[PDB]
Amino acid sequence: VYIIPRPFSNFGKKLSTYTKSHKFMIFGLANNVIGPTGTGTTAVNRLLTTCLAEIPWQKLPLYMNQSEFDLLPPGSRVVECNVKVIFRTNRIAFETSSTVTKQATLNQISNVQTAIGLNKLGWGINRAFTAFQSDQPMIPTATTAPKYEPVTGDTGYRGMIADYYGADSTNDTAFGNAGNYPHHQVSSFTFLQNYYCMYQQTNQGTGGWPCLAEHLQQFDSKTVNNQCLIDVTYKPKMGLIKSPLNYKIIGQPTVKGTISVGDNLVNMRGAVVTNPPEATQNVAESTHNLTRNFPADLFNIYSDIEKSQVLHKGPWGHENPQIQPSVHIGIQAVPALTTGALLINSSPLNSWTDSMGYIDVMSSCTVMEAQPTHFPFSTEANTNPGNTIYRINLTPNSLTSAFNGLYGNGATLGN
Amino acid sequence: VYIIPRPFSNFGKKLSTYTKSHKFMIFGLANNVIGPTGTGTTAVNRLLTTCLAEIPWQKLPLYMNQSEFDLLPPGSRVVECNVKVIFRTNRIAFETSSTVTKQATLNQISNVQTAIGLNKLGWGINRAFTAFQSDQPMIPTATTAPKYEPVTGDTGYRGMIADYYGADSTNDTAFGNAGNYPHHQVSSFTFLQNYYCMYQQTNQGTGGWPCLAEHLQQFDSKTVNNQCLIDVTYKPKMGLIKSPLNYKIIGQPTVKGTISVGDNLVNMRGAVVTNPPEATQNVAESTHNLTRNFPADLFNIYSDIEKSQVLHKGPWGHENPQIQPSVHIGIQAVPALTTGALLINSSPLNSWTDSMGYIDVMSSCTVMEAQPTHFPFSTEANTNPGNTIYRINLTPNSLTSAFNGLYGNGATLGN
Amino acid sequence: NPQIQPSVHIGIQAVPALTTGALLINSSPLNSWTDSMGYIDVMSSCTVM
Amino acid sequence: LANNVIGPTGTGTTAVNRLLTTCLAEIPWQKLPLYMNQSEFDLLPPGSR
């Protein structure tokens, strides 16, 4: 016999990896005297606060910097990504001042506490960055939208990205005897600017503060010291982190006979879905759900600096004509605040010794992809509806994780 | 102990592969009555001609089409690439005409002949495409610059690329009941538009026609039939086939203290070189060489359609501060022309039966690369002078393979 | 003598990353640094002949 | 040395340039004196390597 052997274009797959040794610092925020509504909009609500600092193992920059992100081909997806942290140690002040209250001591009793899922999974909210108190200054005071990207009231504070990497050889605001430093690139401590807490208001629903204590472990620091207590990882359910691959429109009849309607009776589910819980009540709640299904294909990102954009996009990026769900887990590292030696008369506990923990965190991830083309003269990378990908758009934020679950993230913006 | 583990950015390597089943056709060009100087410029010179058709296993398009080429990242280099060909068969005419001379016959005696290195290595030139004769029309007549890219005297003929792939969904000149067809993409025969021959003039040097016969093998076709006689491959010495990677200018003292001169006493050779044979003679030659060394870093290609550009660039692309040499081998497939049954009175042999061979050729290659970045805010892929690459520019063509060796290719343009 | 070659003496560094001040609460820039000095014990030797 | 806030051009000649600084102290294992003193050096015959 004699078969003439067919052609083949095997497009290979780039698969990179990234790591970085961040040196984060936490404070023992005194079991944060709950602050009432961070906004003049929710005014009657509060936040029981913890010192549980948040490691942003979901914001792309924890893993890679500008360029590396910048240079990822379309269809680039994060495969898995991990964080391991070591309680490198904590430091507690020494009252010299005798002043007040706070009896001076060479004693020290502190204790680490870590926690995972809480965030996403439990009943809380990451609300941090804050605004706070004078000596016995560990409890804090102003809530605020958690900071990952940079914030500014014309002056600006922040830049996760730049906090770790510095500026551009030309950028003024940084570079300088004194301006925005390369930190990561040259080992530096930097803080974990978000801590976590729980929200809850007054009357439209009520029963008390649930129990965090049974959702985070606590160690005698010194014991756990210089030993790593974190090391959990996430393999995003859908981490297409660069604008997807365009399916090309060059097949044949109607699918390009014209750009008209090409629709068909399949008899299998093919659209993304939606729950809208109708909370209504008169002394403890009464709900109602209504599945809403919806559309698909418009883009994923733009500003390019949307590296400071979220990671697992399981609730909106439906790849090809089908479906799915789930939320990136969340992770917190920290030390319960050291209590002042407030002698005799303390029968309230409210004096807190300043203390800062140096947690050593390494982050890594894979992300990878292909760059295929199936048409002889087609310009761009290209695939087929067989997969093409598809987003599902909305007026406000899609699942605004900066405000507490119902497992998936409500899509609306808190505080 | 406790070492804080360093970072790492492992940039992966895309490595693709390509193949294509071309169906080429050759004619038994009658042992080509040598044509005098193809140009009114070399007028007194000639070309002993063979039917040895040339398989362009050096022009990128034999392997991949537009897109695939088009989409290769910078620093993309062809790793190895192979061709295997099968004497699928040949066909010889049947004189009905009795006419002339050429007695009609159901007989058939033909014979394949293949050859490799000759091209590059021996004493010849690929000069083809031609312009020729009436019945007993296999010998040809007009030499011409070999065609790989497309040629045109405002009307145009050719397009290797388009010969194999057709036009663009919009391009007029093709697409059409009747215009430039996708051939490859939908199995079609197409011809191997170049054959090979030997040059030689009259008086400035002389001794006769060397012996091709001992540099190409000949088989009894029918025997070798449907069996592959080629299968040689080339792993280019330097096949950077896309504009290289830019080394970035951000280190430190003088190397960016300023953009000045940063030169140094190394005591090791670091520049590309040059031979200029001084052929001068008075009844058989007298030569003199003079090594010329020269520069380095300006670009590799531009028009984008420089896919129709050559493959092994061993004589001009010096990677990093060092050196090297060598030429892509060359390859020919074909059938010696079937002689007419010119009875009795033939005591010259010059009547030739039209015959065409269908050679089945599959081509493939690898080419691959990385896309790394070592600076936090650097935009582009980037490396270091450690390698950066460097070209060596000249007024005319660099090694114009379309005119015979001296092993490397002379850099000047023939016929 | 009438010939050739190249290469650079390697280089070597010893030290401690600077100890950060306990800058409580309000530090959300890190720029306070505790003075600290390391006593590194170094022995050097060579042959020449 | 506190992860040295980069100093712009040490000279009024390169003025627009900077130095990201480390505390990495340099051990001069290349300057002859780290190894031997005056005399010992002083007394080496020619061709001493």
UniProtKB/Swiss-Prot annotation, chain C:
The positions making up the signal sequence are: none
Q: What is the annotated localization of this protein?
A: Virion
Q: What does this protein do?
A: Capsid protein self-assembles to form an icosahedral capsid with a T=1 symmetry, about 22 nm in diameter, and consisting of 60 copies of size variants of the capsid proteins, which differ in the N-terminushe capsid encapsulates the genomic ssDNA. Capsid proteins are responsible for the attachment to host cell receptors. This attachment induces virion internalization predominantly through clathrin-dependent endocytosis.
* Domain free text: The N-terminus of VP1 is sequestered within the mature capsid. It contains a phospholipase A2-like region and putative nuclear localization signals.
Record-given protein name = Capsid protein VP1
